[PDB]
Amino acid sequence: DESAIASTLVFVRRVGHEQDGNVVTLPPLELAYQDFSPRHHAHWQPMDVLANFNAIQRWQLVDLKGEGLPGLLYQDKGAWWYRS
Amino acid sequence: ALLGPYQDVQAILSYGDKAGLANGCEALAVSHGMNDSGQFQLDFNDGK
Amino acid sequence: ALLGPYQDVQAILSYGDKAGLANGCEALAVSHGMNDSGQFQLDFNDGK
Amino acid sequence: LSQKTFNRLAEQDWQKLYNARIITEDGRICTLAYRRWVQSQKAIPQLISLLNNGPRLPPHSLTLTTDRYDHDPEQQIRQQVVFS
Q: Three-class SS of residue A75? A: strand
Cβ within 8 Å, pair D21-A11 = yes
Contacts of A14 (CB under 8 A, 6+ apart): A25, A26
Contacts of A76 (CB under 8 A, 6+ apart): A58
Resolution of the experimental structure, in angstroms: 3.4
Q: State the best of B41, B43, B44 to mutate against chain C, taking most chain C CBs within 10 Å.
A: B44
Q: Are C8 and C32 in contact (CB under 8 A)?
A: yes
Q: Three-class SS of residue D37? A: helix
Is chain D touching chain C, with at least 3 CB–CB pairs below 8 Å? no
Q: Does A2 touch chain D (CB under 8 A)?
A: no
User: How many Cα atoms within 13 Å fall on the side-chain side of residue B44?
Assistant: 6
Contacts of A51 (CB under 8 A, 6+ apart): B2
Q: Are B42 and B32 in contact (CB under 8 A)?
A: no
Tell me how the structure was determined.
Answer: cryo-EM
Please report residues of A whose CB lies closer than 8 A to that of C6: 78-79
Please report residues of A whose CB lies closer than 8 A to that of D31: 30
Give the integer Cα–Cα distance in Å for B21 and A52.
37
